[PDB]
Symmetry: D2
Subunit: 177 residues, 4 copies
């Protein structure tokens, strides 16, 4: 719970800083971007892995509840992920959160920055360096963020647990300058 | 006062909780009024636009009467609420018309509370044409009528800061 | 070769706007242009709208033969073309079978004068003014689940009204 | 002419090589991408400067009609530009050409890289290193590629002249590793 998260260059992640959250896994597409999960709703937005190979993803900024790391972002700690964008087609926030009414638990936008529903934790994934997985604790239980088939491709969804990395969607943080 | 029954294209009095297409008075170009984005900055909520396809009737609405319980006739000059009727909705808000108070155009949009003063309009006779009306809203004192402006897909209803004449066509 | 009839029992005339509407148990409305998948926006497929009161997009009918008056008779090569004041794709509003793909989607952009877009309208079941499309005449037009909903597709080597998409024509005015 | 076109790293451009064609005028946006120019047609596609800050643009590969200078690309020489993508929503080709039928003379996709109607010329552009501009040839006169306001943003159009860089949309080429 004390090992600071690092970007693709091995440097410590910092808040108020832009990063591309890119799949560490299957290198046959691009980064994570907003997109609707299905044709039932266009808002709020889900999180997909773009199929276009050199599209980096839409940048995010990592926020922190209590000044206890100055600007640093530590592992197994409460953080909030917010897409950074000059344009937003939905009347809700860009902060990540979970769709509880979704009977599939898609990771969606619209979450509240300071609220606890938008809380996620970054854990080390497997053994690759600077590689991680995301995990949320809805009501005490720990579940890792995975992915599932959606309209536009694989969309981030909450798994039933965090017992093993097997179902986790591995990610890396690439600094945007 | 003055409060007479609003009538549909067949001259029949309007009934609450009944589907009607709201269509522009003159059957010139386009079809009925439908939900559509007004610009490229937002998908939701939705504006009210006249479709340019000539045989599209428009998306039906139901009318509810806020301040009244007096039979099932909709009357002119009486607060009423307008709600689109559809089996599906792509936005995370209601199908009720209201005013986009915070837009320099005062677009009429979806997502209002059918029981809040925000979503109340009054139907008044328009010009000569029989069974022709206009929608009017009161910020409270003085009333402004619903007109239109050009938007992404076509004319979009806006609160006039002439009115956009409409008629009601019973569904089926 | 008896006349195809609309919902009023009137025979269809060529170059007259008609709504093609699903002659079956009714969840949705008429046939309209829509994209079949996320791989292409153009050309367009034929999809049944899920909205209750959407008539469908209008279509006109044309005949390769020019000696049967203006009557659109059953079992006679005809060309179905969407009628609209605007079109967002480079090709034609005429229906045709996507020669190549799996489900042989019926698509837009055909040549009303080419035999590539000729269809046949024939009686469907022992009903009233209910038909189907076939393609001299042998493959029946059925449907299959697509992006927006049922999309028209040509069926394999069969015409029996078991896997055919039931339709009625409603005159527009 | 004989001089080589250089990418952002000052290296010579090569054929069959993916590059991002990025605007050199501002930092108020991202690279060049396919987008429809107006609501009248979805296909073919125009070339628009995306407003999203970190979108690099959709890669393009450069081709030479002639089988002369191997895989080299030199200024003042005839070349065709073609988008590179595993997905394409329009029937037509990914090759750039001029829409001679529009009053705006929008640069659109669907051209024939082998036909002279898709050929363009990369020439130097005023201030800054490795900065260029594109010019097309009517017959005897050159017309630089500029841009005009379109539905989704600045769209490339064929200018009137090439008397100055004044109305030319400057670009640079960034190799897509
Ligand atoms: C509100 C609805 C919404 C929807 C529908 C989408 C949908 C999509 N976005 Mg997201 N996005 C949104 C809001 C939305 N976005 C917002 C508010 C932002 C902040 C501005 C972004 C930022 C963003 C980024 C940074 C990226 C995406 C990308 C994508 C695409 C990912 C799948 C893919 O790789 O296909 C492969 C790609 C294609 C088939 C070409 C897509 C062309 C798009 C731009 C327009 C399509 C137009 C038209 C409506 C076609 C759909 C028809 C419909 C019937 C299916 C997908 C089309 C990624 C992408 O690939 O963009 C091009 C990407 O890199 N989006
Ligand atoms: C979520 C956002 C949303 C948006 C973007 C729209 C947008 C639109 N709607 Mg509304 N609608 C919505 C939600 C939405 N709708 C909901 C929730 C309902 C209830 C279920 C409806 C019910 C509805 C009806 C009943 C009707 C409309 C119609 C229309 C069109 C009116 C303008 C016109 O006449 O063009 C003329 C038509 C065209 C140019 C062809 C239509 C093309 C559409 C289907 C797709 C465009 C997407 C394209 C691939 C990407 C380009 C996007 C552009 C901004 C660059 C316009 C495209 C009218 C229409 O004509 O529909 C076809 C109409 O009759 N809508
Ligand atoms: C070029 C691409 C294209 C595409 C993708 C579509 C797609 C669609 N059309 Mg078709 N259409 C087109 C061209 C196109 N059209 C042309 C050129 C014409 C002639 C002008 C028409 C005429 C037409 C008619 C007359 C009708 C359709 C309708 C429909 C809808 C049928 C499914 C349904 O019942 O949902 C029900 C409706 C909804 C789920 C809400 C959708 C509202 C539409 C208007 C806009 C959606 C925009 C949204 C932001 C797209 C993003 C998707 C995301 C995955 C990227 C579907 C959305 C039917 C319809 O229901 O229209 C509303 C209908 O009646 N279209
Ligand atoms: C077929 C029609 C088509 C159309 C309509 C577009 C349209 C667009 N493309 Mg292009 N594109 C296409 C085909 C198409 N594309 C193809 C075949 C490819 C190769 C696969 C691409 C590859 C591509 C790339 C690589 C990129 C684009 C981008 C964009 C956007 C640039 C403007 C901008 O900066 O907005 C700023 C962004 C927004 C307003 C939010 C993005 C919304 C997108 C994802 C969906 C829009 C559909 C929406 C439901 C309907 C409109 C609603 C209205 C209220 C806005 C614009 C939305 C750029 C972009 O910004 O992508 C996200 C970009 O980087 N496109």
């Amino acid at each position: 719970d004390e090992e600071p998260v690092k970007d693709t260059n091995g440097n410590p992640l910092k808040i108020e800083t832009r990063y591309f959250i890119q799949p560490a896994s299957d290198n046959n597409g691009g980064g994570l971007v907003p997109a609707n999960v299905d044709l039932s709703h266009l808002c709020p937005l889900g999180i997909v892995r773009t199929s276009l190979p050199y599209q980096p993803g839409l940048p995010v900024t990592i926020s922190t509840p209590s000044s206890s790391e100055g600007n640093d972002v530590l592992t197994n700690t409460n953080i909030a992920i917010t897409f950074d964008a000059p344009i937003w087609l939905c009347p809700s926030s860009k902060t990540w959160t979970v769709d509880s009414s979704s009977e599939e638990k898609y990771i969606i936008t619209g979450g509240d920055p300071k609220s606890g529903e938008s809380f996620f934790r970054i854990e080390k994934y497997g053994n690759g360096k600077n590689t991680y997985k995301l995990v949320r604790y809805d009501n005490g239980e720990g579940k890792s963020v995975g992915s599932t088939k959606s309209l536009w491709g694989p969309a981030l969804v909450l798994n039933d647990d965090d017992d093993s990395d097997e179902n986790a969607f591995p990610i890396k943080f690439r600094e945007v300058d």
